[PDB]
Design a protein around this nucleic acid. Structure first.
Ligand SMILES: [Mg+2]
Ligand SMILES: [Zn+2]
Lengths: 52, 191, 200, 160
RNA sequence: UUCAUCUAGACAGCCGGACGGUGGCCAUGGAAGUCGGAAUCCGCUAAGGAGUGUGUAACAACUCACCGGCCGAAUGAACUA
């Protein structure tokens, strides 16, 4: 049991992000392009799947 | 397109003295003196009125002029960093296992020691980088204050504290355990 | 096409200058559209509220200062979210109608405190778990069978002083509303000379 | 516990004793018999049979007092003057019956107090505006056209 | 290259708001803008969509188009090789 504010703060670092679709790399939530060169700095991003 | 001349202004308050050689910046302030080597950036500094310094690049490309604004930000961090200071607040997130953290000395090294992280029996040791002070602030449960002159040392050591507490082999989405910076501000309140 | 769009607004302000002899420049900051929505209702027919973005308005006066030069003193007072309540009726009844809307909104986050809060003895009813706010700010209290008890009147914050996040968040679940919400009359333009609303 | 007064604004199906599966979840918690709410609503909403009309309930410390709020959308439905519909089987019931210009006004006049509009002409536009969603034809004239006509002046709206 | 926004105040940012008819109409048990079907209104307005989203069984509760202060000078979109 964690206080909801603390849970949101931890999720800001663990869950509130995006993923490069081609690369599966973890990227900042509002980033526009993938950071890893293996995916060509692609703009194909998806939101991190949330809990349930 | 090779801009002919690009300029940025760094403001110097009254209580600071800056002496910069070829690229070696020495900022002297109320609580100390900070130094950085900028030999990798190839920029030009020039005084205006001893309270304003101009940093200039002539014939800068798109990448080259990008580092100009970095230098302004990088130096300005010292100017506010030696005057007003940097403090990062950390909270521990733990569902069941409290994170056992304290300060231990081995051979005079001032290591931040972590035990019982999620029931882990590793004793996590993170060095305290030179210049950053470590203190457990009461009136707030499970909170650390990390302070020092240089943003680089305080923030990176703060990250190293976070990085050593990553959860392994588990759903990071639900096992939200860790130590996370809660606030990024200045040591002196509203100065 | 904004030019013809903007110009039509420019005309509308122009007309109100001549017939309406007064103004109520009001500090309408921190008012909901919903709250301000009813504000139009009571004003039906008697008066009207004109507002625009200061940027065009201040220039727009200058273009009108060509023939009506009596608007110099307005220039400094036109800052922030301010509405020109033009007036063709006795000024006293205007403000009385305006000040009426005084919905006290509980511990609005970010809002600057307009009152010297005297925290009289109140038993919270709050759970022990959330009490972290209480201990952090000192706030001498006693958790009597769960029910925290506020001891005595202490002014944590005063008028015109932003409530700190700690007490600001703390004051929300206590549901005390120091933030009486209302259009704040700062000055009053009267037939060629704006004067502070305080006097009226 | 005599005194405590509570308002419970909620629409209810008219001219019928309401569905037990929908009133008990909400009304039940406040201590009111399911049978009572239906009879109060049904008789009060008799003329509104088969029409969901907004009905406030004055609730007084384990007591009730229903009152059909004069909802514009609900009341305009009455204006079409349609006896009880067989909605159970009458899928997609389009209440588009014709209505003369004045009947909008009296509904609008009923809404004059609550609506903030400077004129009944503005108020009629709203009641015309709802009738646009309602679909009612107004003396064989499009409600949008009448609203333009309200501005255009051809259809002189009485101020009262 | 084409089109747009711009000191009659541009983009960005902190946020500087986000109503009423109305819980629009049909059905879903329950859809109150936001599971689906039809159409995409008017009023106060600087402005607010019969609703881009999160979301509740439904509400709710946030949040977003829209612009709702402040700073003050260039910016946005789509294509081209
Ligand atoms: Mg596993
Ligand atoms: Zn990638």
């Amino acid at each position: 049991i964690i206080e909801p504010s603390l849970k949101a703060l931890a999720s800001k670092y663990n869950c509130d992000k995006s993923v490069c679709r081609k690369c599966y790399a973890r990227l900042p939530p509002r980033a526009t392009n993938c950071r890893k060169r293996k995916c060509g700095h692609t703009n194909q991003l998806r939101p991190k799947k949330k809990l349930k | 397109m090779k801009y002919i001349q690009t300029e940025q202004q760094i403001e110097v308050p009254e209580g600071v003295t800056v002496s910069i050689k070829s690229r070696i910046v020495k900022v002297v302030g109320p609580r100390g003196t900070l130094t950085k080597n900028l030999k990798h950036i190839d920029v030009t500094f020039t005084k205006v009125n001893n309270q304003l310094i101009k940093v200039a690049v002539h014939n800068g490309g798109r990448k080259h002029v990008a580092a100009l604004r970095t230098v302004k930000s990088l130096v300005d961090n010292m100017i506010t960093g030696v005057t007003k200071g940097y403090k990062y607040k950390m909270r521990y997130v733990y569902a069941h296992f409290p994170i056992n953290v304290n300060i231990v000395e081995k051979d005079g090294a001032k290591f931040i020691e972590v035990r019982n992280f999620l029931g882990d029996k590793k004793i996590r040791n993170v060095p305290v980088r030179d210049g950053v002070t470590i203190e457990f602030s009461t009136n707030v449960k499970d909170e650390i204050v990390l302070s020092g002159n240089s943003v680089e040392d305080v923030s990176q050591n703060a990250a190293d504290l976070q990085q050593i507490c990553r959860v392994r082999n588990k759903d990071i989405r639900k096992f939200l355990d860790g130590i996370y910076v809660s606030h990024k501000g200045f040591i002196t309140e509203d100065l | 096409g904004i030019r013809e769009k903007k110009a039509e607004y420019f005309a509308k302000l122009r007309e109100y200058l001549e017939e309406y002899k007064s103004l109520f420049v009001v500090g309408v900051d921190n008012v909901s559209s919903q709250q301000m929505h009813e504000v139009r209702k009571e004003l039906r027919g008697r008066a009207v509220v004109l507002m625009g973005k200061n940027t065009m308005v201040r220039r727009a006066i200058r273009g009108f200062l060509s023939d009506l030069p009596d608007f110099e003193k307005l220039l400094p007072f036109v800052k922030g979210n301010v509405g020109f309540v033009f007036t063709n009726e006795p000024l006293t009844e205007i403000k009385n109608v305006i000040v009426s809307n005084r919905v006290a909104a509980p511990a609005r986050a970010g809002a600057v405190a307009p009152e010297d809060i005297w925290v009289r003895a109140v038993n919270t009813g709050m759970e022990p778990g959330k009490t972290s706010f209480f201990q952090a700010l000192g706030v001498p209290t006693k958790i009597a069978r769960g029910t925290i008890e506020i001891v005595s009147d202490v002014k944590v914050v005063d008028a015109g002083n932003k409530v700190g996040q700690s007490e600001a968040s703390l004051l929300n679940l206590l549901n005390i509303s120091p933030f009486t919400f209302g259009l704040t009359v700062v000055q009053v333009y009267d037939n060629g000379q704006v004067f502070p609303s305080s006097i009226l | 516990d005599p005194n405590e007064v509570k308002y419970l604004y909620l629409r209810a199906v008219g001219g019928e004793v309401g569905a037990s599966a929908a009133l008990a979840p909400k009304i039940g918690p406040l201590g009111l018999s399911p049978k009572k709410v239906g009879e109060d609503i049904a008789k009060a909403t008799k003329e509104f049979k088969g029409i969901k009309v907004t009905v406030q309930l004055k609730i007084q410390n384990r007591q009730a007092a229903a009152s059909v709020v004069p909802s514009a959308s609900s009341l305009v439905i009455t204006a079409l003057k349609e006896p009880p519909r067989d909605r159970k089987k009458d899928k997609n019931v389009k209440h588009s019956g014709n209505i003369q210009l004045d009947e909008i006004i009296e509904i609008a006049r009923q809404m004059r107090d609550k609506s903030f509009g400077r004129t009944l002409a503005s108020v009629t536009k709203e009641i015309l505006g709802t009738a646009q969603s309602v679909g009612c034809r107004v003396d064989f004239k499009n409600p949008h056209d009448i609203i333009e006509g309200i501005n255009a002046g051809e259809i002189e709206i009485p101020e009262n």
